[model samples]
Structure formats: structure tokens, C-alpha cells
Target: SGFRKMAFPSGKVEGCMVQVTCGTTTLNGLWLDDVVYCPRHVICTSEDMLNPNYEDLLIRKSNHNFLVQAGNVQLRVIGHSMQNCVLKLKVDTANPKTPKYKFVRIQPGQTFSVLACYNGSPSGVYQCAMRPNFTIKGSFLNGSCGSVGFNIDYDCVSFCYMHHMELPTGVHAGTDLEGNFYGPFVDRQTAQAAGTDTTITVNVLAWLYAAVINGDRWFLNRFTTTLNDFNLVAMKYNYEPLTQDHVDILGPLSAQTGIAVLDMCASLKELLQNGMNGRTILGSALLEDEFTPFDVVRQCSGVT
Candidate 1:
């Protein structure tokens, strides 16, 4: 026999009692009259913390390949595909006809992710059905979208992560247009050498801080172009520039590094500049802070 008390979201106190003749202590019933939630089953998609949410979907089976997207972080099916299978990932912003991460090789039983962004959908759901022999595990039906708690801000950097391999992809960290190597159809190695590899925002910010601290005009101008006026590169879909949009001043704003940014050149010495076409440039694949939400299972399966 036992009695206990509880609380509510309003910070008010409440009480309850459950007396057993044999003095049994249990909570098998009675939810304490609160919100509803339950954990889904867990299967060996692997030992990653994200995969543990399989229990939430009431599914328990090994050898499964699933894609889980939360926040800007995406748990893609490529990382969970059959071993040694080379997969291709592409988006219109970076590569419209061609693809970035081309011939992306996958290892068996592997769990990894790709950096891409999500696009706005009025009523339609995104779709990309992968190869067979790999089970598609989605947990939105149960409300647990991987409580694994992986850090998206690792090294103060993120990427334009794609969850499902389709157009109007999803982005994770920030803008890659300021310089995403694999973008604009450049070689991967070239992009890496040019410091366009991971889209390091903090590093860019740190560089800005140092340039301002040392009163270095040259370096200041360099980052200013990338940071300040990176909003012009237009594509078929909507793209976001890195600037915070405090860029509405009539005169060339000078914060030691600020500029009218766009009105000046529509160009660059200006790396992200389109090599072939002098008239255009590229924007980040997704808009700034594009936090659009969707249910993966509900989306891919067309469940409304």
C-alpha cells in the first residue's frame, strides 16, 4: 500500500493514492494525468544513439536501412545502406544537372549523414525511394525522432545536409555558397584546398575577429565580400545568403568590414563567383535558418 503526490505544468501540486492488499509498489497504470509519450522499439541498424529510437516506432529488426532527420541534422539511408554500395547525392543549388558527392561510397552496417538543407513544400511531401534489401525505418508515427542528442554544432561548423535524396534538399549548418567546394561543379579536392570543405562559420567569424583586432584592411575586405554581400547568387529555387540582413543601409555601411556588398560589383575576386558566367553567383542552398518541419514517414509515404 502506498500514496504519492504530483505536480502540473502550472506549478500546482496534486495528490494520488494506490493501496494494495499485498503492499505492491507499481506504476503499471495511471499516467499521473500528463502528456502522452512512449518509446519505440530498437533494432540493430547499428549501435549509434540515434538508432535507439527504433523502439519508439514499435519495430525491432536487424539489417535495416532508415533515414531520420531532426533539426538540421539528418540520419540518411546512405550511411545505412548495404556495404560497399556507391550512392550519389545531388541538389539543384550546388549541382543542378550534375551531383555533389558523386559516386558516394557506402559501407555495410554503417551509420553516417550528409549535410544538406530542406526546402519549403506547400502541400506535397518529398520523395526518394532507395534500393531494396534495406528496410526503410521511420519513427515519426511514434513521436520519437531519434533522442540520441548528437551535436550539430561540432567545431562550430555545419553543412547543407540532405536527409532524403531529392530536389529542394535540406541544409544543416549554414551557407556553403560563400564557398562550398563540391558546389558550382568544382572538384572535391579543389574545394577542400580552398577552405570550402566544411562550411566553418565560427572559423570565418574568428577570422573576422582577428582582422578587426589587428586593423587589417586586406583580410577584412576579403571576408567582408563573402560575409557581407553573399546574397546575390540566384538559382531556380530559393537560396539564403549568410548576411544577417542588417544590410539595408543606403550608404556603404562600414563596420570595419561591412559594405553595400551587392550594389558594388555583383562579382568577386570574389571566389563563389560563377567562373563561366560573370553576371551571376550562388547563394547558400537553403535560406538562412530554414527550420521547415515535416514528418518523414508521413512525407515519403504520402500520408497527408
Candidate 2:
């Protein structure tokens, strides 16, 4: 029943440990004005337990509600004042608490980076990309910061076969005939080594149809070695169909970057070849031949 209380200056960053009673509704937790930190192994929940003026909340370390003597868990909760920007998500009418759409929130002046997994029996990778001039750096945050922006778009993309064993440098993750998927990693060196299993020995084949987005023109492309063979399958995503000639066109020789499927692969591959690892392009191309200097190429990659 006895507890010790302590205080510190605002200049210092510190970590503290407190005794908590688990598997009960005894209200064992901490209250702070700024941020609450809990270990990954602890089970807890967050709430705005006080008025907006106070910006106070309880980390209410309770496992009784649902855990029911299950293993411990962890939680991260942010205070009201600590939020510089607010995120808006599509609400499910049946379950209003759960998001009907999936999105990653990126604040102003911050580069967009997120790691999300597509849910499946053998889930495929959902790659995120940014379009130029959409929002400041293509980040879409609503309320208290930015508003009314474009949505992140993606399509079911696939690369054709080349019948060659030698793949370009940065091709890390791939899929097999058995429906198993692997890395589409940006870093080449780290992907090459496996601590437990093995690297992909065959040519990389990706048939991505896993990740979900709110809205877009759900376009599909089949990229080969040349422009003459490029095929486009475009759809409005709203169940409306669009022809390839409606908004799609092959390159004029003057506008084409002269980049090919393998060349783009090698560009990503070689960037990580020297053991230096970071975000690099896995695929890149001009959206249409009419795009200007400011209109950047369409790129797909593993960005963290």
C-alpha cells in the first residue's frame, strides 16, 4: 500500500521502473504531463483520462479485461499536446474503432517511411510510393496541419521472365511457384546473407496483390525488356473501366530515360553493392511521355 514519489528537472531524460499489479483492475499505472514510456514486455492501454487543459492520462496497466492471465504486452501512448498533426482514417460503420482503410501518417517536413505487412495465408508485400507535388513531399496528414490531399496509389505489378540465372544486384525478395514470398529489400548486401536459411537462387518473380489502399486508379503493368512490348491494364478502382489509350502511352524517343527493367534493377543493385545500405529505387519510369522536368518518374522500392 506504500509507494515512493520522485521528481526531476525538465532538462534530463530518464527511465524509471515501478511495481505494477497485473491480471487485475487495481489501477496500477503512472501519470505524466509529457510522454509515457513502457517496456515492450509489459501489458497496458492508453487513455485521455483528464480534461484537455491538463493533457494528463493514465497508462492503466490492466490485463484483466482481455488478457485473462495471458503473457505480458507493451503499449505506447502520446499525450494530446504532444500531437503536432492529426490523422484521419476511414471509419468502418460496423466497428467504428477499427480503420476501414489503411494508411501511414507522415508529419510535415518528415520523409515518409513505414513498414506494413499485407495480411494473408502467404501475404505479399505492399510497397508504398510518393507522387510529386501532391502534398509537401507527398505526405497526407489531415487536421491541425495539412488537409485535402491525394491518396497513395498502387497497382498489381509484375515483371516478365528473362530465362537468365544472373539477376541484377539489388533484387533481394521474390516469390516462388508455391506462393511463398520473400524480400523486396532495398539493401543488397544484407539481403544476400541468411543467418538461418538461404538467399533466392532463381530469378526474382513478383506478382504483388497484397497491400490495400483507400483509393486510386488501379493500374496494372507488365514490364519487359523493351517499350514495344509494354502492356497496360488500367482501371478506375471505382469499378469503372478505362482504356490504355485513354491515359496511357508509350515513350517518344526524346522523352524516354532509356531505362529498362534490368537496368533499373542494376541501378538499385549496384547502389547497395559496396556494403553501404539505404533507400534506393527498385523500379523507375516516366509516367507519360508528356510529363515535364518537374514531373518525376514513377518509382517503386523498399523505403524505410
Candidate 3:
């Protein structure tokens, strides 16, 4: 009701009562004729403070990115606030050793660079937030206001693996031309002695077969020349090596039968070499087919 009255020197009454009012307030502004408009409080939204949109960028980057053994990765955080937002970061929150107690500031439009690696840095998530007034939870409604936040979820993984097996018919026996074992095959005690974890299983049939195929010169010559020790000792003494007919017949059968036929041949040689050739089996009134060489003789003796 505090109004200033204007009077004019006039006859009779001083015209009509003329008054002007100008109120003073700080909280809210109002709209009058010239100076009576109230302005609303405006603050920067999260998107205004971050470029490339937080959700889209985070999703796309996190999905496609990967960590490798002995590898390094870099993350780039971009700010798009034109009015300027103060940024803060908590690096590798998942790792106990990382600094996560305090928030670090980066000015507006600045890029925050974060580096990670498998060997050195522990794998985890990194968090960043907005703090304009240097407070833990600064008010974002100031004249120059901005608010945005993001996280980098990272866990470095190492992949160093291989797969291996054996040749059919146990020909190679998981070893090269030399006796050195390969792939997952190795002398268990020796490998363990060298500080490697290992498991080994032994089988006489496989070992004897491998010895026949890849053993020393004497063993190889004896098996190859006689076609599985079938020839008599006299033949070897007289240098009467087996004719090509004996060798030719067995070659094709190995391919057609997958070298299983050779298993019988190696077994026959084992029987004779180990002095078990004439050994008899009780059941069925005859030796087992594997223990007898007659089946192999039909395959090895002649092609016709």
C-alpha cells in the first residue's frame, strides 16, 4: 500500500488521486508493464553436460571393447557443457588399492584420460560425477549450472589356450619323429619336476605301437624290414629282406582299415620279441584274436 501520490496545481480538487507502486523482492520476479517479469530458475541438464549422449556412448563403447593378455586400454570421457560443469572422478572403484575416497576435478569441455592394463592395473569400474562448488554434492542450480556422470566397467581377461589330440591307430603316440612328447602329452614326472602341472596315463599297447612306428633305428629297421617281425631270423642273417610283394600288400590295407590292421602286426612282433609268441589262453580253447597273429598273417603274408 506504500504508493507515491502525484499532485498538480489545479483548481478545486487536485485532479484525481494518482499513485505509482514499485515493490522490491529478491526471491521471485513478476511481470508488470516494463519491469514486472519473474524469471524461472534454469540449470543445465545431464545431456547438456555430456557429449555424444551418456547412455548411447557408454553402451556402445562398453559392449564392443575387450581386454587382452598383457594389453593396455584407454578410456576417453568428453564433456559438452557450454556453461561449464566441474567434473570429478573415482578411478577403479572395484579395486581396493585404487584411490576412491576423493573426487578429482576436470573443467568443462576437458577430456578425462584413463589408462588400464592386465598386468599392472587391477580390473574394475571407474566412476565420475559432477561437483560444481567443490562440495561433495554441490548444488547444480547455480547461475552457471551443469550435471553429468558416468562409469567405466572394465575387467581385463587373459586368453592363452590351445587344443590337441592324437593320430588314429596311435601311430604318432602324441610325439614327433623324436621320442619327445608333444601337445598335452608329456612325461608327467619330468614335467612336474620343471614346475608344470601335468597328468599322464600309460598303456602297453599304445607304447609298444609307438615304439614300433617311431622307436630307435634298430627297432624301426626290424619292424619295417620283416613287416612286423614276421620273417625268420635266418632271413635277417642272410640279408634276405622281404620282397616288395610282402610290403606292397600291407600298404593299401592300412589306408582302407585306418592302420588298425597294423596294430595286430605290432602286437605280433611284441608277442615274439617279448617271448610270449606261443603262450596259450585257457578260455574258448584258443588264444584271443589280438594275441594270435593268424589274422594278421592272412593280411600281411600275400596280396593275391
Candidate 4:
């Protein structure tokens, strides 16, 4: 019963009176309307206290708005609070030596756009690092933010060939046109001594085939004679010489089955010479009849 009566001009109020509170004495009672209380300690709440209206965080900044061309690419950084920010770019997460990123510093309210000029080689995913402060955060969705992904298409010269094999029949032994079937096609020791066996074989085959097809005087003379003005036009534009080897390869088959090699070569040479300002020189002819005595030549050349 420590209530006390207080009288005022307008009203009377009952209040709790105390003798002492804490280290102070003559404590006043709670005046209801005028009294205030606060807990000396507090425990944090587990409720969802985050603002629900906050914008979605942009994780993938680099690849946000990227456009990749043949050998060029464009990257855009999109997200809130990116104003006046600096970013570092990198490519090929595995190999650090092949870098493809461009560093840029932007000011507040400025836009982020990067034009990447690449030399059609190392092409892959590029990542970006944004350093806003001491806290480090990666682009959202596996380098999707502040990063660009692209591929580069390049041109390459392809080497191709047509091969034939003839199994032994009666008095004739089996034959392979390129001699690729002769002995061990590859000998590591010989290859090492004479440079890669495959490379040597390819070179030799290329020259051999060229000689067999281009150096045939008969095919060349025939082609020049038959094509006439066309042949003159071809010669003016560096037409290739015709060779009997082309005939041998393209002639034996049924007319419906295959095209004549001489005609094909002539046509090809003419088109290439005229269309591409290129020249062709016919080499020697490769004939099965000539190969009939190949053993003799091999023996003479000391190749067993």
C-alpha cells in the first residue's frame, strides 16, 4: 500500500511512492501518464526484419547484356548501386596467362559498357570482379554479372586426300596408290631422324601427287588444245596444267560412276584461275602401268 495522493487544480491522482531506487533516494512514484520504463537488457528478435521492398540483387553483372561477334564482344554491367564503381575482368578461369578483361572505373550515375576486341583465339567465359569496399562479393549466377561469354570462329586450311587399294589377284600383287600400305607406315626412329613421319609422308604425298597430276605433258597439251579460247583465258589467270594421272584416276570408272580426272582437273584449274586469280602447274602423271614396275624402281632406289 505505498500509494500516495496527489492533488492538482484540475484533478487528483494516486501514485506509487518509493523510498529509494538504485543509488538515489527520495524516489518519486509512477505518475501513470508521466512515468516511463525501459528494459536494461535486450534480446534480438528472429523475426523477418529485412525490408521487403528492396530490389532484387544482381549477381551476374558481366554477362547481363553481352553481345558476341566473330572476334569481338560487348559486355554490360546492370544492377542497382553500380554507379561510380570499378570492375576487374578476367577470362579462362583455369589459365590466368590468357587474360581478356578490361578494367574500368565509373562515376556515380554513370553507365557501364565494355567493348572487347579479341584476336579470334582464346574464347570462353569472362568473369568480372567488383570492388565496392572491403567486403568482397562475386557476380550473381556463376559470373553472370559483370561478365561476358562468347566464342570465336576462325578460318583454317584443311588437307584432304583420295586413296585407293587393290587386293592381290592372280599374277598381280596388292597395290595402294599412296604406298601408305607399304611396310610399317610409321617408324618412330626414322621419323625422329627425318622429322615426324606423318609430316614427311604428308609432304611427300602432296608433292608426289602434284607431280603425278600436273607434270603430264599429254594432259596439259590436250587441255590447252581442247579448251581453246577458254584455255587462253585460263592461262592468263594462272590455270593449272592437266596430267594423265587425273585421267587414270577419273577415266576407268563407268561414265555414270565417276567423272574424268583430266576434265575435272581442267575445269577446276580453269575455274580457280579465273575466279581466284590463281595459277596451276600440271605435274607428272601417276599411272598404274608405270606402277607395274615399281618394284624395279624400288630396287634401284635401294628401298627394299
Model 3 global lDDT (CA atoms, 0 to 1): 0.22
Model 3 TM-score, 2 decimals? 0.16
Cα RMSD (angstroms) for every candidate in the order listed:
21.4, 21.1, 37.9, 37.6
TM-score against native, each model: 0.21, 0.18, 0.16, 0.16
Ranking by lDDT: 3, 4, 1, 2
Best by lDDT: 3
Count of backbone collisions in candidate 4:
21
Residue 248 miss distance in model 1 (angstroms): 6.3
Stretch of 10 with least lDDT, candidate 3 = 12-21
Query: Ten-residue segment with the worst summed lDDT in candidate 2?
Result: 205-214
Decide which is better by lDDT, 2 or 3: 3
The best candidate in terms of TM-score: 1
TM-score of candidate 4 relative to the true fold? 0.16
* Per-residue C-alpha lDDT of model 4 across residues 184-298, encoded as one tens digit per residue: 2221112211111111111112222333333322223235223354445445543222334423433323132233333444544443344423332232222111111122122
lDDT of 3 by residue, 1-304 (tens): 1111111111111111111111121111111111111111111132432222433332333211211111123222121111111111111212222211212233211111111111222222222111111112111122111111211112211111000111222211111111222233331211211122111111122222332333211222223323435445323322123334433544544443344434434444444356433433222122121211212322233322
Q: Deviation in angstroms for 23 in model 4?
A: 93
